[PDB]
Design a protein around this nucleic acid. Sequence first.
DNA 1: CCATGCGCTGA
DNA 2: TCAGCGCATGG
DNA 3: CCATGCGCTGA
DNA 4: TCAGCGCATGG
Lengths: 309, 309
Amino acid sequence: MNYWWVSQKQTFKQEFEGGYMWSPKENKNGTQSHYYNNMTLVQPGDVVFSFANGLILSVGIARSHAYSYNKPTEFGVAGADWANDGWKIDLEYHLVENKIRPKAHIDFIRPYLPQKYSPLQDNGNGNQAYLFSVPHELASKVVELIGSEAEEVIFGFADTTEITTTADAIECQISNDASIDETEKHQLVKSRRGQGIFRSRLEQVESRCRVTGVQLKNHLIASHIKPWAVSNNQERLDGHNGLLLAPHVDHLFDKGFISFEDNGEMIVSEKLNLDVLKAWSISQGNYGYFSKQQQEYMCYHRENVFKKL
Amino acid sequence: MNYWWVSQKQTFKQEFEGGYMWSPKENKNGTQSHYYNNMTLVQPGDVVFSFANGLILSVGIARSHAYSYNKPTEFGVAGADWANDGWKIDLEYHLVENKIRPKAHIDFIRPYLPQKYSPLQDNGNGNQAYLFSVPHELASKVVELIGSEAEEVIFGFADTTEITTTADAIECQISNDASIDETEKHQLVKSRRGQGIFRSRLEQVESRCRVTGVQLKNHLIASHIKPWAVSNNQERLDGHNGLLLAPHVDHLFDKGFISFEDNGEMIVSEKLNLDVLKAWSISQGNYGYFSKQQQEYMCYHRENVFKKL
DNA sequence: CCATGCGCTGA
DNA sequence: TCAGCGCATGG
DNA sequence: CCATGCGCTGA
DNA sequence: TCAGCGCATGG
Ligand SMILES: [Cl-]
């Protein structure tokens, strides 16, 4: 997941109200702009900090790659200088109550500014350009300053969108892969959504939500332990590579907010606000023993899915 | 959603272990069979009752339309009579502890048996054929007899698969509609998953899971009130046509297990096992008041989504 | 009238 | 269990 | 050296 | 507000 700084002082209202980022393709003499170029490197699920009148107003999630769009008519005078031919990105705006003025924290920030294409000068004054790369180290500091409601937008949200993208790719490769017969194809694709032979088999091994106790099949999700995306065709359909979970536990476990030791002990990530568990009346503690086959898979989960610091 | 009866006395082990239904295409002399024909009318998410040794052993969900497949080699002698060229369906088997003997309920059932292609004779003896249509009125009686753990497989599970299918259709028609520009297309498609400008807007109106109290954006789902599927392009992107919900509340509300009055009072469906709410520590009662625009949408939900009997 | 078919019955 | 007896369906 | 640009300043 | 004044970047 990549981070971005978007200086929007001229047109922030229009871009937030429109739920978009927009720039020209080139500068007004036809020449290449690294800033406008950056538009084409923005991935769905990449975080974008909106900066205007010296303040960070939005922690944004990008919901598109840059697509060829003409200047917004609602820009008026404020964007008369910009070429009509432009890049547009759909940005999931998230307003933040705590709008940090970066300049006022420059002492903390400056060391994490990149040497070239910094959004800020060394005095902490914004550079005159539209879009800059934000190195993850700098990103982590901006986030620290804005506090909770920046972490809220990233962890188990924005940083899940690229995972989803990687899984979609794999689902297309399966559906065009001759090497696996039409039944395997069908049962692999269905196993992803927790359907087909995988679900049947899981129910043979487990009978209820390990955490909540619910046994009713219509209120349980057939989540994998080792995620579908990284599992071989054997493990994608293995009943032992699965847990029946209530949707909110599936949520917490799928994203690695909680995991389990081999002994059943719940492990809670530092990234999970304990308030969540209190609000959903979920206790820490032992949720029963795992089979040897299960413990193999639950280990991969701890080391690869479960969010560490 | 269509229901089906599949008589599997000869090959049930093989078909359940394989997570499939299979029949020949035709009878021994190339002649047409309405029963084998029925294979091609089976829709994903259609419910299929497995009948063997006079008992219903499975309430199945179909995970495929019928596809051209040769006889399973594991049938051996037991299926030597059947042509090799056959139909195959992927069946999500769900075993039931309460295995009803339909014959023993025949006096109650008989009137709801169809005139032609009944799976049962009037004495309640199974007919010698593989697959029969089950009309919804007869279906409702079988379900009544098997009790909860048939309802488990159907309500908010099997009957959601066909909804998903209808929604996918709509998402493809949007993406091929010349009349709506590339931004509308993108924001309608993303609004479905609770993403893009719809999410931004919803956050303007609502700030927390109405039920659980969770305020953290990474543990909240942007569910619509009036479902995406039947909302006009205005309502698909309306912030007032939405609720921020914890995943397990999104689950219960999106499928109509719970709804709300205009006053905030939770309404619990007859189809929701109250055990669920106790296990997830959710109380009935008032979950705060709705805006007038919200009350319009919440009403449609009560009458169209919220499961009544 | 005859043929075919994933049920049905245990001498 | 393996055969024989049905009934429902269709040529 | 010259050109360009979603910040910044103040009348 | 919007012209004019910077710095950052590149031809
Ligand atoms: Cl109102």
